[PDB]
Design a binder for these strands. Structure first.
Lengths: 154, 202, 202, 202, 154, 154, 154, 154, 154, 154
DNA sequence: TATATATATATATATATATATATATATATATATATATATATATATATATATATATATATATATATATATATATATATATATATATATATATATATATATATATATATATAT
DNA sequence: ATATATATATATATATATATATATATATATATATATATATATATATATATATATATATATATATATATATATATATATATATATATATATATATATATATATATATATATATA
């Protein structure tokens, strides 16, 4: 789907689409009869509500990560593409390492994403003033790493 | 920014979109069957007038528009040819002087206007017999178009727009693209329609 | 400004528009089945009177209107032919002197009035038998129309509009366009109707 | 001014208009099925009385009225024939003297009244047997109608209007227009009815 | 067929019998398979309906002719047989002469039907009261002629 | 409908019947739901009221015409039928000529309505005292005209 | 076939009879089995529908020719036979000359059809009033020619 | 529709008919359920109200134009037909030229509508006094033009 | 087969005739039993459908060639026969050269078809106006060549 | 769709049409049952409201751009067509460059839109006074450029 | 009205029969239910991680398709509105009288 | 009382005719023109969504594995036992109805005379 900044619209959209999925789920074939019954209807409504509530409560960390990635890209003038890419990186590193700590050291994932970013790690960007600038991927990668630890207070 | 690049045209489904949306609206007025017949007749009329005339003209003229003033800024040419089909032909409400004055006032070079008028006449005479007879057998060009069409329009008075609307093609039957003579060339388009229904089990 | 260019005419759907809208309105008076029968009879009557008389007259006369006073400003001619079909024929309420006086007062050249009156006579005698017999076998012209129609009207009294309304066609049957003799020419129009429903799976 | 020209007559829908409107009113009194049966019976009675007598008489007499006093100002003739059907026949409440006096007082020539009375008798005897037997086999005329009808009425006392209302045709069955003999001629009217429903998918 | 007054029954009879004829027509041999399909069935139904509508529309004139002949005969106390015969005469004279005008003058048809009625032309009938009465054929034949011309207002 | 002298009862009759027509009009098919909403109900009520108001304000001239015709007929002892007919005539002459002046001279309408009243124009009436009287139509026709022009102060 | 005015009945008749022909065509011998399958039945139905639609669309010109021939004949009082013959001539000339213009001048076809009508070109007809009249063939031929040229506005 | 002078009745009529159209629009097929819910009902009511308000605010200029054309007709004794025609003309000239100024000069439209009114431009009219009068169209056309510019204060 | 303009009817006809041929092919001798089986019937139906689909998709080019030949003939007033012949020529030259390019140069096919058209290449044609005109065969042959190259944009 | 100056009516239109789309979205097939439940109805109403609010809040900048383009055209006497074209240009340049800054220099877009407006860039226009005027596209393009940066205070 | 043919019905005792009902027990067969445990089968659930297939969500941009929304004008189809007159159709409203139909009111006898 | 009949008569309104006429509104023509829409082009540009990709992540769910365990219910056994039913057989006995006898009547239809 196209990019959309997170807002209440997203909440309600997920809510109603889960309504459709649940009404499909309960009445595996007899969807009509279940659709006519108001009691099971209230049940499905409250279910979808709880489900959206879960999905919201389990997304604030990724939101903060994308926020700080946005701030870093802003200070280093990086095109939106790599902003999203670094958002994904930060979410990965917080999830697999900072929260659950799957069995892998930080710098290992760092070099993994480095091989991801090669072509090779110092990209040249021409700002809106015409002044070109260069930034090392590995440096800012390590940079957002520590800044992330500052957020979670690790 | 730069959300998308929309394209506006007759897309082999404008018929269905029109029918469906208007049917949906009118069910709350007529009931099912009356709304059905209503949207049927409405689209049939809209087709046989607007499609048959304006869409064929637009498809024929588009290449020349691109050659002359190839741009997205061809909209003035589009409104010009629209008024040409309406205001001058089938109504004789205005002489070529009005259009040329208006569009040079709108910033259009004169000979461009003359050329477009020439071609729209040269094809409209092929589409509708009445205009073909009013102009007779004269190949239009930016050297003779204005004088000829001005003679034609002044010779006549302003005709009621009912002529421009429906009755013109209604009273006179024409050769189909399903005939001998000069009606043996285009049904390829309609041909696809056939195939379509067969594939849909229809 | 110049929003659109509307056209007002019988567009092969006015039946459906009439039926649907009045059915919708009346269902709040009758209920479904009664409103259905009501609009059925209503449109039947409106058809066989107004269509059969006035619309045929208008489609006959329109070219002559454009010839005579080709303009958008032919509305006086339309109201003239309406009054002629109503006030003089089928009612004998006013003589040609009245109409000619009224419309020259409205600025219409008299001989034009006489021509139009002659033609509406020459066609109404084809549509309605009773008028054909009242006038007999005399071709009307702007030289003799006024005298003849005045003789006919003065010979008769003011007739009740109950004649002009329905009863005229009700009491006497006419040759169908589905017959031999002079009823073998027009069903082409009706023919399309059949084809239409066949294509709609009807 | 001169908004329209209304025409008031039986238009093959007064049945439906009557039924529907009175049904709409009476639902708020009886409920659906009760109101349905009620309006059905009410219209049936109104039909078999008012239509079968008065409308047939009106359709018979209209041309002669136009001949005699051709006008919109023929209403007094209409009320005359109404009273004739009601006050004199089917009730024997008044002699011809009363009608002739009253209508010459209203400005009607006497022989006109006598003629109209003659014709309404000559047809009412065909419609209703009892009146035909009361008058016998005498063709009424403005020369003998007054004496004959005066003898017939004075021979009788005032009869209860229950005869004039319903019972007259109720007690005695008559030959249908669906019969041999003298009932083999008119079902054309009903015939159309049948055709109609077949077209409605009914 | 026996004499039956025209009625809605007649309309429906013609309708259904034309249904049978049409289903016979289409499936020249495979009548059964054609009978099984509902679509061609709808087509045949609408065909028979249109045909009945045609036949109805083209019968009102002959009907009015029979009507006025009935009125005249009732006025002159003529037995039913000759009433039907004069109905047929009026139908003939309106069809061939009044409508299409095949190339024949009226009085010629008059004398034709006169020889048709001979044996000679002044028939004597004994009314229900026992009063015998005489009527000239050629006279009443002419009588309905003018009366006919009045109906179509000829 | 039978004759009923104008009174407020007629006003209210028209009002309620227009209510019914309007509720029929707005909810072309969904009349019930529209009937359930009080707001559209208020709107329809006010519309019907305004419509009655229009119809009233544009009827007083007709009332005055019928009044003066009543006075004249009373002065000439004319039966109700012709009283109503002359009321209608006064309506016609004020509408087409006095107010809008469609292009026709008064005497033209005069002779038109004269032929309307022919059968010629001097009818005899028997008063309650047994004294027969006669009145000329064309005379009283012109007579009410002058009386009419007196009203509007033309 | 006897002459019948065009009507919807004609449309449906052609429809059904083409249905019979097509069901004969497809199952060259195994007509029964093809008749049993509803799918090929729908196919044949739509095919016959398309053929009727075409035949209707490509007949209106000849119809208008017959119409104007009828009008001219009515104006010149000709028996039906020559009316049909002139309908035929009008269709001939519009088809071979007006539409496709096979290699022949108008006057050539004119003289051809003249020799067709010879025996000899000024026929006498007795109208219904008994007044004999005469009309030249070649004249009315050229007359309907111009009239025909007027229709297509040639 | 028949000609009715603008009044509040027209406002309410347009209002209710827009109610019907909007309730048709929102519930494209589910018109009933949408009709049952009072919230969307209030929304549609307010929408139709706003639309009426728009249409009213964009009509007063044409109203004034029709007013002044009526005045001119009254002072020049012009029959209703031409009153409406000149009303429409003034509307056209104010719209296309005075307000938006499409690229066309005044006298051009003047001659256009002149050919619109031809038959040629000095029509003779009979007043109620019988005194015939004649008026040049182009003159009274040019008359209302300048007078119109006085209105807008151009 | 006689000349028939392409239309949907042609699609359906090819479809059904291919049905006949396929049912003939599969059940080589016991075609009846295969005709009775509905599954193989569906298979044959879809086969014939795919066959028509192929044949249609492989015909648009020749159709456009015939179209442009029709335009050229219309502008040069050519009798139908030679119009069809040039349609065939354009088909040949696009097929053998433009699409597959068998080993032959343009002018070679040109002179081949020229010898085809000889008797020698400047034919005299008398238009409907009586004005005889002449056209060179080889010239227009060269003319449609470049014109054809314009269509495919070769 | 036709041009309509933005107003509250537009807000409401978007609102209701989004209601229809959402009730379509939730009950993918069981649209009716979902239409019957008031709770999901309230949810859909609130979602549509939120989405309209989003669309409104994210449109004001384009409105300001259209406003300033209107002012410029007004001072420079430009016909409506090019007014809309320059509105579109201003919208594009603010979006891709000023707000998100896709990586492209301003003058590049300038030359792009210049080629867009060619035919070359100094068009002649006729004011209402008949005085012709000429304006350079590239100049006024660059002109509204600076004024645009003036708005956002870039 | 008279037969005969069997269709039912109402008045008293025998069939096979099932409709069962009971009332007493005994079977087999089964539907379930427990009560302890054991299987396999699949219904979810949770625990941990991994896949695959999808449903949405987001993060950047790019498409096509579309729903709208504008911004310019032009069409077409309409929905209303107006300005002029004319229809037909029907909604009422008058103005005179006449019907039927039924809604209530005014003189004595029945339900 | 309310309501229904059996005669006579009002007023009142429900409709319907019988004429003339309004005004009002329901549509429909007839021309000119608006305005507001419903769509459709014609270009340009958004914005919002419906989808689809183009990579990287989420959460959530739908399933499926990959192991371990639940609890729950679907069945199936393993044994003992119930309880309730589906039948069946045992014997006795009611009532009910469904067909057949064994007589006497009906009434009702299907026929036949």
């Amino acid at each position: 789907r196209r990019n959309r900044r997170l807002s209440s619209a997203s909440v309600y959209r997920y809510y109603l689409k889960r309504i459709s999925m649940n009404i499909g789920t309960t009445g595996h074939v007899n969807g009509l009869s279940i659709a006519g019954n108001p009691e099971i209807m209230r049940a499905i409504a409250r279910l979808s509500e709880q489900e959206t509530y879960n999905w919201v409560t389990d997304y604030a960390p990724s939101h903060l990560a994308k926020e700080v990635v946005k701030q870093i890209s802003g200070k280093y003038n990086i095109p939106g593409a790599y902003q999203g890419l670094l958002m994904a990186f930060a979410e990965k590193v917080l999830a697999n390492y900072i929260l659950d700590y799957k069995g892998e050291p930080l710098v290992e994932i760092h070099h993994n994403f480095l091989w991801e970013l090669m072509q090779g790690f110092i990209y040249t960007f021409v700002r809106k003033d015409g002044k070109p600038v260069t930034v090392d991927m590995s440096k800012v990668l390590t940079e957002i790493e520590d800044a992330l630890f500052k957020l979670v207070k690790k | 920014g730069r959300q998308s690049h929309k394209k506006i045209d007759v897309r082999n489904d404008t018929s269905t979109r029109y029918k469906g949306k208007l049917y949906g609206i009118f069910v709350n007025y007529m009931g099912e069957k009356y709304a059905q017949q209503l949207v049927e007749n409405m689209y049939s009329n809209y087709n046989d007038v607007f499609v048959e005339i304006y869409n064929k003209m637009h498809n024929a003229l588009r290449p020349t528009l691109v050659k002359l003033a190839g741009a997205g800024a061809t909209f003035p040419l589009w409104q010009l040819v629209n008024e040409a089909i309406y205001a001058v032909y089938l109504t004789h409400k205005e002489t070529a002087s009005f259009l040329v004055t208006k569009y040079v006032a709108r910033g259009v070079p004169a000979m461009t206007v003359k050329t477009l008028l020439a071609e729209v006449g040269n094809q409209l005479k092929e589409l509708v017999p009445a205009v073909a007879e009013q102009i007779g057998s004269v190949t239009l060009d930016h050297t003779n178009v204005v004088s000829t069409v001005d003679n034609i329009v002044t010779s006549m008075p302003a005709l009621p727009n009912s002529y421009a609307g429906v009755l013109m093609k209604t009273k006179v039957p024409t050769v189909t693209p399903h005939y001998a003579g000069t009606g043996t060339f285009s049904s390829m388009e309609s041909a696809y329609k056939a195939l379509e229904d067969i594939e849909r089990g229809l």
